[PDB]
Tab-separated table of C-alpha atoms in Angstrom:
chain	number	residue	atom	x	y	z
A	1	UNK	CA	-27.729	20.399	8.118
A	2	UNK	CA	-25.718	20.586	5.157
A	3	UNK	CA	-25.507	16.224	5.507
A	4	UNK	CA	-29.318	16.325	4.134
A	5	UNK	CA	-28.752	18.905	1.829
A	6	UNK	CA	-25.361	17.044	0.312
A	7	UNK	CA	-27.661	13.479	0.447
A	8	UNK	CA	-30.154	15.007	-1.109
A	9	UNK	CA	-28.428	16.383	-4.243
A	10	UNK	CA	-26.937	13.255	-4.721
A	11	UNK	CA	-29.924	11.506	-5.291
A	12	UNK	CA	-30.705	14.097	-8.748
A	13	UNK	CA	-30.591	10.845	-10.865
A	14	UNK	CA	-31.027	12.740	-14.257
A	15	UNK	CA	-27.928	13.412	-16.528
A	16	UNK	CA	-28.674	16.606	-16.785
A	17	UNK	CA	-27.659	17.989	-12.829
A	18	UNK	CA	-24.542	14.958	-12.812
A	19	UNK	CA	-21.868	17.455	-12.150
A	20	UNK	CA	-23.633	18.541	-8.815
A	21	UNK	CA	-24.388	14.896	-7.816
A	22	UNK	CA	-20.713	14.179	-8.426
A	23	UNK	CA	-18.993	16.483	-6.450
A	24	UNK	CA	-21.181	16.569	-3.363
A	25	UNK	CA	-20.748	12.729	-3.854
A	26	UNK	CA	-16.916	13.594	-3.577
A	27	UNK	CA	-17.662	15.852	-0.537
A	28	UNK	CA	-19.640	13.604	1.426
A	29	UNK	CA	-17.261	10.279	0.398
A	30	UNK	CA	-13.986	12.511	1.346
A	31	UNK	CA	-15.450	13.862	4.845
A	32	UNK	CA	-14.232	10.875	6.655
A	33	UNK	CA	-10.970	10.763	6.622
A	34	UNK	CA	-8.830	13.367	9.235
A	35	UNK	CA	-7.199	15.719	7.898
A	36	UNK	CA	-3.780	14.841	8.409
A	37	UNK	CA	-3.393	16.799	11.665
A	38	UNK	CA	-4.946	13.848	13.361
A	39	UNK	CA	-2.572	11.199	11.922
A	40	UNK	CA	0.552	12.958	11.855
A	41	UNK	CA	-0.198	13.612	15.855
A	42	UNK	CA	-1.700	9.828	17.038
A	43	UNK	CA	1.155	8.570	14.834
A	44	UNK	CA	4.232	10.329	15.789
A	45	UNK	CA	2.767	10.379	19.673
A	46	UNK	CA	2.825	6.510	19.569
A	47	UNK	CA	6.205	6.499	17.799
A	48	UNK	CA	8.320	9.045	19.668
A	49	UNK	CA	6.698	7.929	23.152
A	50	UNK	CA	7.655	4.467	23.073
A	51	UNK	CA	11.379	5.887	22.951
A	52	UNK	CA	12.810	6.865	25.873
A	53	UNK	CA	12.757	3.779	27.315
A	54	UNK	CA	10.971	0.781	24.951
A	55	UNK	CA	9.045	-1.299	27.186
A	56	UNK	CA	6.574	0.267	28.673
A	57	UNK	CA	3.716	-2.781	28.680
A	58	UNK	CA	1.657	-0.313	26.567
A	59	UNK	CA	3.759	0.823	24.303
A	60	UNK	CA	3.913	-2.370	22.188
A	61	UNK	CA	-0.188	-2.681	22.642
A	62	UNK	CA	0.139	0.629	20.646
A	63	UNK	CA	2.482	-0.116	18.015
A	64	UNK	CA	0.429	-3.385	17.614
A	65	UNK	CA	-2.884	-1.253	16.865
A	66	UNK	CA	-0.612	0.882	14.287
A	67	UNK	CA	-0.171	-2.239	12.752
A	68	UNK	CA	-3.733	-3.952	13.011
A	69	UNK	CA	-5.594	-1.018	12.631
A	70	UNK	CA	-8.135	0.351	10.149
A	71	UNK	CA	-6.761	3.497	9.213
A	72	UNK	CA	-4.242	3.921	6.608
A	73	UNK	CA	-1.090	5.124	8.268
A	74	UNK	CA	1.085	5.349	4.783
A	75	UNK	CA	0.611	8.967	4.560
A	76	UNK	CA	2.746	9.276	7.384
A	77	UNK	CA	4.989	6.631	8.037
A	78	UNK	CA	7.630	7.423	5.651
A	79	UNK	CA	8.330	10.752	7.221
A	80	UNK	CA	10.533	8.759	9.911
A	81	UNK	CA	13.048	8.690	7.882
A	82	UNK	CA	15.160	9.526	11.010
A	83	UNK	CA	13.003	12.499	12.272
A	84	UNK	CA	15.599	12.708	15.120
A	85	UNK	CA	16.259	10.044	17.380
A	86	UNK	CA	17.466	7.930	15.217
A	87	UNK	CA	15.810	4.696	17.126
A	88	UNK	CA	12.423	5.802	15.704
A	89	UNK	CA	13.817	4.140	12.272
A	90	UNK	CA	13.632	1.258	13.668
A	91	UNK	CA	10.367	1.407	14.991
A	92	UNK	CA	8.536	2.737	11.726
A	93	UNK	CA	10.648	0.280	9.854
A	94	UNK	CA	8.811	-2.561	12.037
A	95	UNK	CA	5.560	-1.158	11.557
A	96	UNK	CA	6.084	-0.598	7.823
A	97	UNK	CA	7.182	-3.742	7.049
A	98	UNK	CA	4.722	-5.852	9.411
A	99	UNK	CA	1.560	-3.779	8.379
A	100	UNK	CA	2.519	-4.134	4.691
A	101	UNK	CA	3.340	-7.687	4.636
A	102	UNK	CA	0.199	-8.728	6.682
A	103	UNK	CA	-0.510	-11.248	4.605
A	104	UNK	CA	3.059	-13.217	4.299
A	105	UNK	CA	3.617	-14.933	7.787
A	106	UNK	CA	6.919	-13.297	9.543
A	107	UNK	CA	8.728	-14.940	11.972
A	108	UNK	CA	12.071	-13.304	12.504
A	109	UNK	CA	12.725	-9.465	12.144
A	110	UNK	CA	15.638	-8.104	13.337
A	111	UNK	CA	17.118	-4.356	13.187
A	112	UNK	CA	20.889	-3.637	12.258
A	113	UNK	CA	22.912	-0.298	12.520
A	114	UNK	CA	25.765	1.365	10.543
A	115	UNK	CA	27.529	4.275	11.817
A	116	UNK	CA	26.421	6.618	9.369
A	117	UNK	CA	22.746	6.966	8.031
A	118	UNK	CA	21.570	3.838	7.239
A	119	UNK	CA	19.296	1.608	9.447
A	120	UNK	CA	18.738	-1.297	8.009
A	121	UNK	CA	16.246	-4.249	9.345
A	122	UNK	CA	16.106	-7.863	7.904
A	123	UNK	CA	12.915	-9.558	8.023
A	124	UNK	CA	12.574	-13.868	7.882
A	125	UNK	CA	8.813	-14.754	6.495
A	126	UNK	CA	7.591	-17.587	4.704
A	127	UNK	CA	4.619	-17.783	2.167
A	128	UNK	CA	1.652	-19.673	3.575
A	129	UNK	CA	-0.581	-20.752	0.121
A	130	UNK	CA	0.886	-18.889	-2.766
A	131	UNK	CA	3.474	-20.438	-5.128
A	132	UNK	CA	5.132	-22.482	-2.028
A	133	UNK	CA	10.942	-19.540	2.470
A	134	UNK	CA	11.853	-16.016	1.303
A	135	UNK	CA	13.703	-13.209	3.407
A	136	UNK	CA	13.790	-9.441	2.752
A	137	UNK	CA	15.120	-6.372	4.029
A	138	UNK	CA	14.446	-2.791	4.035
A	139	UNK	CA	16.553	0.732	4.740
A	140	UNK	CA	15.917	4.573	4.093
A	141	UNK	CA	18.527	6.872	2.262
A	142	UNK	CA	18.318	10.797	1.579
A	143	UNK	CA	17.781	12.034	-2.178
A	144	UNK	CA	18.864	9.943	-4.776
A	145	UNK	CA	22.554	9.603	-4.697
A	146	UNK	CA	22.914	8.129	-1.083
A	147	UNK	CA	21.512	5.169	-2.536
A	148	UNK	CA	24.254	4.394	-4.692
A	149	UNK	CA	26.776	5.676	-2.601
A	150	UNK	CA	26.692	2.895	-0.020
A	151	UNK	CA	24.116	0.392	-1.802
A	152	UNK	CA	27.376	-2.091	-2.018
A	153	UNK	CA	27.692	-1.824	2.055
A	154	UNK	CA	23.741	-2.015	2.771
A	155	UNK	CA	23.356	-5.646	0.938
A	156	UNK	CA	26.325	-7.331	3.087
A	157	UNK	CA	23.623	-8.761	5.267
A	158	UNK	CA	18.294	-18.813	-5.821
A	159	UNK	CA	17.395	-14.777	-6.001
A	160	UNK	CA	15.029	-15.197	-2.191
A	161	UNK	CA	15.899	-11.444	-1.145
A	162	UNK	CA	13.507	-8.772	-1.296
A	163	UNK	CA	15.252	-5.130	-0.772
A	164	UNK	CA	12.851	-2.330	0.175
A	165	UNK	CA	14.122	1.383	-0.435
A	166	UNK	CA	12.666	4.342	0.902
A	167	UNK	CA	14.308	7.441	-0.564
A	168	UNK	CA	13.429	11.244	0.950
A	169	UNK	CA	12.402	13.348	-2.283
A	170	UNK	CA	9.792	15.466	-0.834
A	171	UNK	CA	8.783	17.564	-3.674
A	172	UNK	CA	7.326	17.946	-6.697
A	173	UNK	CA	5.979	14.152	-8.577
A	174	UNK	CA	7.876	13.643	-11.307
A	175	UNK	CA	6.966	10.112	-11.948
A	176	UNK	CA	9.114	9.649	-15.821
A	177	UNK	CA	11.948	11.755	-14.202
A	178	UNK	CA	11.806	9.650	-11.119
A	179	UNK	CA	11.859	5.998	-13.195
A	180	UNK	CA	14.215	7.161	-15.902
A	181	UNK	CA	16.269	7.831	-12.257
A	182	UNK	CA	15.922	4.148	-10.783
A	183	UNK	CA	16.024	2.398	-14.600
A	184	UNK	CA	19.669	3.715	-14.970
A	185	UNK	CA	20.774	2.330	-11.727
A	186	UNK	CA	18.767	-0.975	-11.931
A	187	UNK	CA	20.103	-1.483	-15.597
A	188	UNK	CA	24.185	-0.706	-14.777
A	189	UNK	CA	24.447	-2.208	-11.731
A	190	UNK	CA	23.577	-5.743	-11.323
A	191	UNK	CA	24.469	-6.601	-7.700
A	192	UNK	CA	20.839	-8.039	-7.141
A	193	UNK	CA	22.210	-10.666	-8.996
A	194	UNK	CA	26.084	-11.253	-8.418
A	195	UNK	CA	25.724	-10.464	-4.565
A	196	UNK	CA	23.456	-13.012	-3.582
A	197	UNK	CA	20.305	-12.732	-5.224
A	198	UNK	CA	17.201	-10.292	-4.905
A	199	UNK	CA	13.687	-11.144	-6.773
A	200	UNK	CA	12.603	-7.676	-6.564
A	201	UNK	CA	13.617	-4.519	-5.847
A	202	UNK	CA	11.017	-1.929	-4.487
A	203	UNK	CA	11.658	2.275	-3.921
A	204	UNK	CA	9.046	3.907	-2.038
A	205	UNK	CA	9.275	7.666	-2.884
A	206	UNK	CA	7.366	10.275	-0.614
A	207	UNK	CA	0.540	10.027	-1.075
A	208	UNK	CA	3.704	7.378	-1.626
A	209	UNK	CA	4.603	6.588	-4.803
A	210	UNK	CA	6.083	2.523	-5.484
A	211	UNK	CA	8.309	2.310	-8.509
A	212	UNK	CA	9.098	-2.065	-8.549
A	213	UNK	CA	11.778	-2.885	-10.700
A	214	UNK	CA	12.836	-6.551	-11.647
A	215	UNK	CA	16.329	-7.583	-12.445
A	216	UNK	CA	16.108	-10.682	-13.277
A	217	UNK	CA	14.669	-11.580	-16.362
A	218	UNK	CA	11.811	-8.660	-17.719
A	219	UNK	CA	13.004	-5.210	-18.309
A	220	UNK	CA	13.323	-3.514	-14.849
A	221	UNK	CA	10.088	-2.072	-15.334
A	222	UNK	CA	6.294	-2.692	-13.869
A	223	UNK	CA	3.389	-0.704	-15.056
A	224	UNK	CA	0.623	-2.738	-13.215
A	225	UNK	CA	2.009	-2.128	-9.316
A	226	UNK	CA	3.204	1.044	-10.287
A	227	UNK	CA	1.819	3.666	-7.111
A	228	UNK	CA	1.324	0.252	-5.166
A	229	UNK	CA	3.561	-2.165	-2.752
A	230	UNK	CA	3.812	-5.418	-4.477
A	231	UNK	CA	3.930	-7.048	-1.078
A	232	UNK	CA	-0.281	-6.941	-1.419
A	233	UNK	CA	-0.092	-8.827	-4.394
A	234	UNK	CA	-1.566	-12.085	-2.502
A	235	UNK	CA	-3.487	-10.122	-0.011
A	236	UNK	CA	-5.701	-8.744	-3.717
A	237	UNK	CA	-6.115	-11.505	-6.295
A	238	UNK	CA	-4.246	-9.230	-8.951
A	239	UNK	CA	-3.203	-13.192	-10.753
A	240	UNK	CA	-7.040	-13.785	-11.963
A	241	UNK	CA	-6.721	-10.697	-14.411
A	242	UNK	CA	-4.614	-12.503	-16.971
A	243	UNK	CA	-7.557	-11.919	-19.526
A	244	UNK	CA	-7.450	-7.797	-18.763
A	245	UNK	CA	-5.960	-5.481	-19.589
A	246	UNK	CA	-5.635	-3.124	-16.805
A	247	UNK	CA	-4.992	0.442	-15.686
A	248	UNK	CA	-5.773	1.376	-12.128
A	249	UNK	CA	-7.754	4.222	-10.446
A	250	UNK	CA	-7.174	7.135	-7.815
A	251	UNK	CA	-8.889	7.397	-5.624
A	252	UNK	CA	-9.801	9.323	-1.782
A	253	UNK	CA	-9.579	6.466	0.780
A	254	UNK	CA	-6.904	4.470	-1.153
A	255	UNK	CA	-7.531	1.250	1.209
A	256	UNK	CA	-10.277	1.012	-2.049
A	257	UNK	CA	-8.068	0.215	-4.872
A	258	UNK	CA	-9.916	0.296	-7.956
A	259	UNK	CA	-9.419	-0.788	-11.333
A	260	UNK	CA	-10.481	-0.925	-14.859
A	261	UNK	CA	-10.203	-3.823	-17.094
A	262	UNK	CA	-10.747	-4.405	-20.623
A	263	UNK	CA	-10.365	-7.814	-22.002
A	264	UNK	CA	-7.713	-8.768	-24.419
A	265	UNK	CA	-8.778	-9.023	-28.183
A	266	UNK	CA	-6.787	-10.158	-31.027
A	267	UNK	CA	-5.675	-7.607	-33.693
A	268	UNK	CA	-9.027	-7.844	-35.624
A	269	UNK	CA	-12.121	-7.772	-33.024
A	270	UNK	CA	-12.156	-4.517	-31.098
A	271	UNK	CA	-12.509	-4.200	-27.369
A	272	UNK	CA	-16.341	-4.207	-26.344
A	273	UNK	CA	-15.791	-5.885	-22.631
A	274	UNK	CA	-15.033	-3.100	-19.809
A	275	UNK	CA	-15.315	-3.714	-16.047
A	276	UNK	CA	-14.632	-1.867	-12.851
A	277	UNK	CA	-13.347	-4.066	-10.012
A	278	UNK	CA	-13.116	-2.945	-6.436
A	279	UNK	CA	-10.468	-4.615	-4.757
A	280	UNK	CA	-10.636	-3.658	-0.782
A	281	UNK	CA	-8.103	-4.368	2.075
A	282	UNK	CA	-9.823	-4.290	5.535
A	283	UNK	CA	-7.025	-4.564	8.159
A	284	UNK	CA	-8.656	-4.860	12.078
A	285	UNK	CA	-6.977	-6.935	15.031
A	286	UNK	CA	-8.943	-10.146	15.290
A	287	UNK	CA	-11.970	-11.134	17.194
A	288	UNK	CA	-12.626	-13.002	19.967
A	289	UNK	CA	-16.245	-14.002	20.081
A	290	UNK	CA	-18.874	-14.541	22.886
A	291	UNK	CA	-21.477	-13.780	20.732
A	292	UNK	CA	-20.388	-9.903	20.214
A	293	UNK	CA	-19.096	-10.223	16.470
A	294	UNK	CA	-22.494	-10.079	15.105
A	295	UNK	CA	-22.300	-6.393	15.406
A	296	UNK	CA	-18.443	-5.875	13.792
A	297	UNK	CA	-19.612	-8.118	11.142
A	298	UNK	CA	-22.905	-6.316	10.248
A	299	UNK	CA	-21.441	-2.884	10.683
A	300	UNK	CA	-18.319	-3.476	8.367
A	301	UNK	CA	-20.084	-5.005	5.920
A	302	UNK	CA	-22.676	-2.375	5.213
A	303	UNK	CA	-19.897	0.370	5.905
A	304	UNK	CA	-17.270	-0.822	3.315
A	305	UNK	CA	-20.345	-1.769	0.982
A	306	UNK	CA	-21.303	1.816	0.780
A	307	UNK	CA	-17.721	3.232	0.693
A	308	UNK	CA	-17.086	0.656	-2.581
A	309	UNK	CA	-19.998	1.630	-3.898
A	310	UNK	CA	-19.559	5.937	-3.475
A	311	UNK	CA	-15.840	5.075	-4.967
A	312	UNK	CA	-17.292	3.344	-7.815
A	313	UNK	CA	-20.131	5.417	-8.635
A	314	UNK	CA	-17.453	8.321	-8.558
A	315	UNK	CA	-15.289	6.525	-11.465
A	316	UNK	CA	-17.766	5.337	-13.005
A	317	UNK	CA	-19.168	8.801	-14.143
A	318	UNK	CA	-15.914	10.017	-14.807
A	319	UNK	CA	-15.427	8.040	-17.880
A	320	UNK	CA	-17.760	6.506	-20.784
A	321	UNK	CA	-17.059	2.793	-21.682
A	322	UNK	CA	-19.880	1.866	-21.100
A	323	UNK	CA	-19.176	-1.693	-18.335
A	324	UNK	CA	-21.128	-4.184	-17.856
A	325	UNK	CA	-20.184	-6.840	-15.294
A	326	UNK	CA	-18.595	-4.652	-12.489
A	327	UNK	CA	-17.180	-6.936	-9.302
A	328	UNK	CA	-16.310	-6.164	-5.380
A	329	UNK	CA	-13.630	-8.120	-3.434
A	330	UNK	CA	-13.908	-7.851	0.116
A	331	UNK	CA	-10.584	-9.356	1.848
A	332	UNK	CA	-10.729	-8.890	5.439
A	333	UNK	CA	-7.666	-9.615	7.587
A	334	UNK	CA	-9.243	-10.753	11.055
A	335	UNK	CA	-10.465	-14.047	11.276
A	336	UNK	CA	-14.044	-14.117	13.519
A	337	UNK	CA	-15.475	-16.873	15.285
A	338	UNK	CA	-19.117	-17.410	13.765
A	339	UNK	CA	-21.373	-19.835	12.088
């Protein structure tokens, strides 16, 4: 009842009733995702069950479908920090790692202990068509100062190592206090590059907020992955903006990442060029097909069609630059069997 009413205020095309139109756009866009009850419980039930003895034969189906599902689980799995088992680490580490780094092929993971607070797990991938074998890591620590406290002890596992760092600071974003923070440490100490070599170093602070920092040859600073994993940097086509200029987007449904671009003038010629682009991850197990895809295929595309174009319409009303050429990218993960 109040569906028709919200679908039918959106449609007031004239200026003059946009505020309306906007915000039951925002309602109606926003009342689809659960409200964090849902994933907190489906999430932890999946990750504390498979505990108490791993190995269940459905267990690992489950911790699969964390991986290869549709729904963003980010919200919640940084929370396992420990939580209290202390094996669950190493379980949300997996996940982490293997839904975030979909894209790069992983062959080798493997989970390591110290007897303190600090599971760490080392990951072996390889990078199927993008600048062609790298190896990574990641580990959690508790407020700032763990970190540093045992970050000499944590790396005893050309610069091939990626280091992911999840740090518990659950209050209040402070994002200048937080990177004035990690450019102190990144600038003194210089074991990514005396030890044996990291490319990248990545905190994750707790929805999540990425801070990447390079210490290798640019000021250990990055303003263009800045609230976003770098690990999806093949998985979106974020090399093809060269000519842009570019600052990204919130947004509700942040599987949706949008940005704006403006193209790079000289000093003389102003900036006249603005576009939106849409830049969608679709993450689903894949399909076998005996003639059933049809319907996944038809029912995806019009759904994330519609959800790109609610986002859009959203930011594009909430600014005045007047675009031109705005552009959708689609990338689904599953590969389908179909002509």
């Amino acid at each position: 009842e109040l569906l028709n009413i919200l679908t039918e205020l959106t449609q007031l095309s004239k200026t003059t009733n946009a505020k309306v139109a906007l915000r039951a756009r925002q309602v109606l866009i926003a009342s689809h995702l659960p409200s964090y009850e849902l994933r907190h419980n489906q999430v932890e039930s999946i990750f504390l069950s498979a505990i108490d003895m791993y190995g269940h034969q459905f267990c690992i189906e489950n911790l699969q479908k964390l991986i290869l599902s549709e729904t963003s689980i980010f919200d919640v799995l940084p929370n396992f920090f420990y939580h209290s088992n202390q094996v669950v680490r190493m379980a949300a580490l997996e996940v982490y790692v293997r839904r975030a780094y979909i894209a790069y092929e992983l062959n080798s993971v493997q989970h390591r202990q110290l007897k303190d607070n600090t599971c760490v797990v080392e990951f072996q991938f390889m990078l199927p068509t993008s600048h062609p074998q790298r190896m990574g890591g990641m580990v959690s620590f508790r407020t700032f100062e763990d970190f540093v406290r045992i970050f000499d002890e944590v790396m005893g596992c050309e610069p091939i190592h990626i280091l992911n760092v999840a740090i518990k600071t659950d209050c209040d974003i402070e994002d200048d206090r937080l990177a004035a923070m990690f450019r102190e440490f990144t600038q003194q100490n210089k074991a990514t590059l005396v030890d044996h070599g990291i490319r990248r170093l990545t905190f994750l602070v707790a929805f999540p907020k990425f801070f990447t920092f390079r210490a290798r040859d640019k000021f250990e600073e990055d303003r263009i992955y800045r609230h976003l994993e770098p690990a999806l940097a093949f998985q979106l086509e974020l090399n093809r903006m060269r000519n842009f200029d570019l600052t990204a987007i919130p947004c509700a449904n942040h599987k949706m990442h949008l940005y704006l671009g403006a193209a790079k003038v000289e000093v003389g010629t102003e900036v006249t060029d603005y576009r939106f682009f849409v830049r969608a991850i679709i993450r689903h197990s894949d399909l076998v097909t005996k003639e059933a895809s049809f319907e996944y295929l038809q029912n995806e595309g019009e759904r994330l069609l519609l959800e790109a174009m609610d986002e859009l319409e959203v930011a594009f009303n909430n600014t005045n630059v007047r675009t031109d050429c705005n552009h959708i990218f689609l990338n689904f993960v599953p590969t389908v069997i179909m002509d």
